[PDB]
Amino acid sequence: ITVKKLGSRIGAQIDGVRLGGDLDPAAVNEIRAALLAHKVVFFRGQHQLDDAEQLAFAGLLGTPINRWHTDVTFAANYPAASVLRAVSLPSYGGSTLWANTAAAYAELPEPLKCLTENLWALHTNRPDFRTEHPVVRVHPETGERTLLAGDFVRSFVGLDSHESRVLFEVLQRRITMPENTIRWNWAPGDVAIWDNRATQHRAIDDYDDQHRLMHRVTLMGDVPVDVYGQASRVISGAPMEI
Amino acid sequence: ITVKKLGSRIGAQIDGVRLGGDLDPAAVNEIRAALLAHKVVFFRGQHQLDDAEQLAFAGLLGTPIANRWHTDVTFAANYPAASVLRAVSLPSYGGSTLWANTAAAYAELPEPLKCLTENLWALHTNRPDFRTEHPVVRVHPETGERTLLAGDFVRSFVGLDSHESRVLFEVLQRRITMPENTIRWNWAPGDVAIWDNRATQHRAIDDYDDQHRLMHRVTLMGDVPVDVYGQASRVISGAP
Amino acid sequence: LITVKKLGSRIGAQIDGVRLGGDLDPAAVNEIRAALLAHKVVFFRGQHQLDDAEQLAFAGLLGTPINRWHTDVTFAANYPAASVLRAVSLPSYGGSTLWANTAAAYAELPEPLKCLTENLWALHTNRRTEHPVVRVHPETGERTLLAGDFVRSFVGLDSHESRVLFEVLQRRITMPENTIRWNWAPGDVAIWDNRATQHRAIDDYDDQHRLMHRVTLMGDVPVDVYGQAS
Amino acid sequence: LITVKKLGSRIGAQIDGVRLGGDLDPAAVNEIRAALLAHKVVFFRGQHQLDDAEQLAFAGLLGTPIANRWHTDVTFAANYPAASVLRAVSLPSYGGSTLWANTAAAYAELPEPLKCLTENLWALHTNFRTEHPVVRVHPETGERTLLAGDFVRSFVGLDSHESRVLFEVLQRRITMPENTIRWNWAPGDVAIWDNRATQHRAIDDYDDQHRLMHRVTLMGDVPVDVYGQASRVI
């Protein structure tokens, strides 16, 4: 299997792989290794994939279930990863952004490390979920610390409205720096997988309003732990199921 | 020539044309049309290009003269109108480039911000020592469109203090650099880019791990900007 | 007749020679409205004669009677024009109040900011009305900035834009040069134009008890410089 | 006979029952030192005697002798003033108040994430360049106090835009009115402030009126952060 780096901090393309549910366990393994190391990986020309064949291949990586955000973070046990397939694409626009929340963290100045390591945020959905997540989580498989924030954040705990907004923007500025991100131009047969535990993503609304359809499969993740081993606190449950 | 839209607010790719200083006027005019409407145009497969070839093709467009979002050399009063840029040797990964539409940014402003910007002036400096008060809104000499003039050379706004100047600057830079208003170009060999420096900002991305990278650029002479009441930029230090 | 002393270059005055009450002189009552309009906040010392009925009585000769930086209940379309406030029992330390001059704040704005605010509208809710961020003063014709802590947003702007711009404005409005901080003493009475000021209490007397009696006059609806109304 | 009255709950006191000069008892000049430490800025009314030689004489009793933006005195220096003495000479007919803010109370009240940030944050001070901690430990009281103010040009390891934003977050907490005192200057007024645990700010609301004050600024040791580290010069 070939994995080519697309950027120094994030992104990688993978070929020599016909995505589907009957993959050799060692191919599935090299893909995961790449996914964890590159945060978002891309597959071209998987015109063969359909909804069910895609659902089947995601079953191999884990347990199936605009603006900058990590997926569903208003819930305590939000997704670990997602498999997204292009199905109907607009003649122009419709490209997608991802940022590396692990690298964002590692690159912090130590003062900002100390602050984030001790900062918690309340994540809300504008069904009513409210959750208190650490701003730094320890990645369950890599041990890498990653910044947890994004659009679902409503406030930092213990801080006033003004300071919350301002610090949020400071961190979002560092996460979404172009050097730390990748913009993907979708072509038919394109497939994207990303580690929702070490990324944020953002749809770009620049196909005016043509027709756009992508299919998505989401894998189960677990509750974030901060650097001291404390878990996210649910304020308005409940967890995600299945 | 055939022109393909890359995004709803900025960018187009043009096929059906070989680049040289011997192109048909009817083709040069379709390209200037295309550049003016799309703000940045991309040509692929232009392998034949070469320093003097490229320089000769920029000549049909005007008179020949990075990691921070900016408009080219705005610390000068009559800064460049346009640039033609060619990749020579590219890194193995990374090394893309961003452009944003400062014309579309102005048009989308909320009414109160239109007022503010229409009456605001910035001091652009080269941090030789250039200093130039520009309007924050310039009226484009060919399209008549209003466009935002800011970017990384803006040292401050006229009649505003540092704290408010830095805060308003951000508010403006945020709207200009909205992903819906930008294009990010993955460079390939044979790639040429042309942008209207009078209606855009650009930003190089440093993510090829300081591999080696070479691009050739020809810049074209531009006019002094005029605000929406017909007043022109003022020099404080330096010459055209 | 009476006396008026400037407490600062942009705001506040102290008036001497007057015994506040409902039997007060027409000329007196007139030099006071004059002083209030001109100086935005006015103070009288030594008024130990006042109870609530006489404070009111006097509020009637001026008009019609009824924390964080703010203008009084702006989330209301027709919010109060002016207040009459006296100390009842003060703490032993702290307890001072701030006023800021919104009219001078406008005047001092750079043209770019003038043009912005003359064209800006804000959403004022509680704890819901849209006002001009500049209102023409129904008596002085002075232009004044109408913001303050009741603002939830600016019409047409997004959340990051609203906050950032509100702070820019509030920072100019509450600039020390443009405010007055009053140290209360018994017998003290403050009168201010709610249509040309913001005010803020200071919570710096710990748990001591602090008690004030206030009468509020009726204010009209703000109109912008285009004759537009909330 | 010497009485100290609190002026606000977080900052300020007036000291009555004292005439200033070089002749005060050790115990008196010590009553003054302790009030200064605990209240951060202290005021003396009706001190019509003092002159430019009486002030100096008194200053030496507390130490070793030597504007409308919130700041801490001369922080572009590695070893700035520990305290200053200020007397009114000629005052405008209106305005001319002064503001002080308590940088010890401000630190103490930071939420813990901010404490963490500030205990580890360092600032560059330029009028000359110097590197101070954002939290300094006070030589006498032990108190941790915020070291910021207008002479700060940037934070170490943060970019221009980041520095600015955080600087304002800090300043906003330091200059909160509950944490400040605004002194209305009267002739014969003497103010004394601890420059190691305060910021101060002149208010410029008296138009074109000559405001004449006379200051005696005492000597101060170099700052250390919560790890015993010290300020650097650049």
Residue numbers in the entry:
A (entry chain A): 4 to 68, 94 to 154, 177 to 292
B (entry chain B): 4 to 68, 93 to 154, 177 to 289
C (entry chain D): 3 to 68, 94 to 154, 180 to 282
D (entry chain C): 3 to 68, 93 to 153, 179 to 285
From the primary publication:
To provide additional support for a role for Rv3406 as a type II alkyl sulfatase, we obtained a crystal structure of the apo protein (2.5 Å). Attempts to obtain diffraction-quality complexes via soaking and co-crystallization with alkyl sulfate substrates, iron, or cofactors proved unsuccessful. Both structures contain the “jelly roll” arrangement of antiparallel beta strands present in other known non-heme iron and αKG-dependent dioxygenases. Rv3406 has two disordered loops adjacent to the active site that did not appear in the structure. The homologous loops in AtsK are also unstructured even in the co-crystals with substrate bound. The active sites of AtsK and Rv3406 contain the H-X-D/E-Xn-H triad that comprises the iron binding site and are highly superimposable, including binding sites for 2-EHS and αKG. In Rv3406, the polar head group of the conserved Asn residue was oriented towards the solvent, creating a hydrophobic surface in the active site that might favor binding of a nonpolar alkyl sulfate substrate.
The resulting hemiacetal sulfate ester collapses, liberating inorganic sulfate and an alkyl aldehyde, as well as water, carbon dioxide, and succinic acid byproducts. Here we characterized the single putative type II sulfatase from Mtb, Rv3406, which is the most highly conserved sulfatase among mycobacterial species. Rv3406 shares 54% sequence identity and 66% similarity with P. putida AtsK, including both the iron binding motif (His99, Asp101, His165) and the arginine residue (Arg267), suggesting it possesses similar enzymatic activity.
